[PDB]
Design an enzyme around this catalytic site. Sequence first.
Site, PDB file in Angstrom:
ATOM      1  N   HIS A 182       0.850  -1.226   0.000  1.00 55.26           N
ATOM      2  CA  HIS A 182       0.000   0.000   0.000  1.00 55.26           C
ATOM      3  C   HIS A 182       0.870   1.255   0.000  1.00 55.26           C
ATOM      4  O   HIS A 182       0.737   2.077   0.907  1.00 55.26           O
ATOM      5  CB  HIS A 182      -0.995  -0.028   1.149  1.00 55.26           C
ATOM      6  CG  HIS A 182      -2.108  -0.980   0.915  1.00 55.26           C
ATOM      7  ND1 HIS A 182      -2.144  -2.225   1.497  1.00 55.26           N
ATOM      8  CD2 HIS A 182      -3.222  -0.879   0.155  1.00 55.26           C
ATOM      9  CE1 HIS A 182      -3.249  -2.847   1.118  1.00 55.26           C
ATOM     10  NE2 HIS A 182      -3.924  -2.045   0.288  1.00 55.26           N
ATOM     11  N   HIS A 215       1.822   1.640  -5.749  1.00 49.52           N
ATOM     12  CA  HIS A 215       0.401   1.208  -5.836  1.00 49.52           C
ATOM     13  C   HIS A 215      -0.461   2.383  -6.306  1.00 49.52           C
ATOM     14  O   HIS A 215      -1.256   2.196  -7.255  1.00 49.52           O
ATOM     15  CB  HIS A 215      -0.073   0.633  -4.497  1.00 49.52           C
ATOM     16  CG  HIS A 215      -1.531   0.330  -4.480  1.00 49.52           C
ATOM     17  ND1 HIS A 215      -2.074  -0.646  -5.274  1.00 49.52           N
ATOM     18  CD2 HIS A 215      -2.550   0.882  -3.791  1.00 49.52           C
ATOM     19  CE1 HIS A 215      -3.375  -0.705  -5.056  1.00 49.52           C
ATOM     20  NE2 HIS A 215      -3.699   0.231  -4.154  1.00 49.52           N
ATOM     21  N   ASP A 255      -8.142  -0.626  -8.448  1.00 50.97           N
ATOM     22  CA  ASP A 255      -7.511  -0.947  -7.148  1.00 50.97           C
ATOM     23  C   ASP A 255      -6.983  -2.378  -7.177  1.00 50.97           C
ATOM     24  O   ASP A 255      -5.930  -2.616  -6.566  1.00 50.97           O
ATOM     25  CB  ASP A 255      -8.478  -0.735  -5.993  1.00 50.97           C
ATOM     26  CG  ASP A 255      -7.782  -0.624  -4.655  1.00 50.97           C
ATOM     27  OD1 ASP A 255      -6.524  -0.469  -4.626  1.00 50.97           O
ATOM     28  OD2 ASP A 255      -8.508  -0.656  -3.658  1.00 50.97           O
ATOM     29  N   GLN A 309      -5.719 -17.722  -3.395  1.00 55.65           N
ATOM     30  CA  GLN A 309      -5.779 -16.928  -4.656  1.00 55.65           C
ATOM     31  C   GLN A 309      -6.952 -17.409  -5.531  1.00 55.65           C
ATOM     32  O   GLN A 309      -7.702 -16.537  -6.010  1.00 55.65           O
ATOM     33  CB  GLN A 309      -4.416 -16.925  -5.352  1.00 55.65           C
ATOM     34  CG  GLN A 309      -3.392 -16.062  -4.620  1.00 55.65           C
ATOM     35  CD  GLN A 309      -3.779 -14.601  -4.571  1.00 55.65           C
ATOM     36  OE1 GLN A 309      -3.746 -13.897  -5.576  1.00 55.65           O
ATOM     37  NE2 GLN A 309      -4.154 -14.124  -3.388  1.00 55.65           N
TER      38      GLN A 309
END
Length: 313
Positions: free
Chosen positions: A68, A72, A217, A269
């Site tokens: 973060h 990013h 995002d 995942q």
Amino acid sequence: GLMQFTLPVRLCKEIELFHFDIGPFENMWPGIFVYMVHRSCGTSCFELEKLCRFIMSVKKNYRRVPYHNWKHAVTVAHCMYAILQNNHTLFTDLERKGLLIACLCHDLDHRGFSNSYLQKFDHPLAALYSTSTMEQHHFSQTVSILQLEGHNIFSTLSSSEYEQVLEIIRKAIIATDLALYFGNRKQLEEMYQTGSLNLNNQSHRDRVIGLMMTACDLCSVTKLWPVTKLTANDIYAEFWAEGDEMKKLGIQPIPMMDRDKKDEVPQGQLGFYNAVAIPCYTTLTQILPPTEPLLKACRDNLSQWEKVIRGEE
Ligand SMILES: O=C(Nc1ccnn1-c1ccccc1)c1nc(C2CC2)ccc1Nc1cncnc1
Ligand SMILES: [Mg+2]
Ligand SMILES: [Zn+2]
């Protein structure tokens, strides 16, 4: 006025593609952002001196955390650039201005911890903002930087245009709370399939910009496998640190955040692509057909994780 940003040939070409990786040279990322604002919005929409000063204050207010971070912010801004360039006529002048800034600012002063961890820690931010805790903080930091001397990049907007662009940015940043994503996508799914979706309805535009914010995002799952695989390491470095901090509060963290359970990552995942990522880019592609390359790349990475599980890598 006549000072255009130009990238080297390979970047100039590949920056137009959804799967672009901004690279390891931090000192080039401001220039990459201004290049995108200039081509996406115009060379006239911001005063270069103010924009440059705004960008460098935003960079300073991102922390040195594994995922973060400043890289990013710029990665998320590029995905929004690609969506806007591939959907030229769909977006207002204020929307193109606001959304690239929203993306750059959307994780300002992130500490590497979930809203959940702040709540269980009893952080002061959890008392000030009961829901979308970190995201209200991110918007608050954006307004703070906009109010620094010489940092008002919207100064030429009218009083009512200014209020509109700050409302676009607030909604865009709040929408990056993944807790709000599930309900938003469901409602967009129903609106698309019953044919009631109307881009002239402001409440509908907000939902569609919300889904674009989730898509941007999460866009590390839409990169070529080597980028996605290496970015996955950075996200889990944050998750495992939060898990450690959960253990310090006397709470067994969810497996996703337990570093003793690294073996479960491939299966984790799969769930993430199936429950979150594929549905997000599927619904986005139905609403904005030219964003199909994000869905295609996402499906490619799901197939790579299935190959990891089957021991083929
Ligand atoms: O993997 C992620 N989450 C996850 C793993 C296992 N279960 N879940 C999961 C399930 C439901 C809801 C939230 C989390 C992940 N999350 C996020 C956001 C939610 C914080 C961003 C990227 C992410 N992955 C990734 C990033 N870059 C390259 N490759 C992969
Ligand atoms: Mg965030
Ligand atoms: Zn983010």
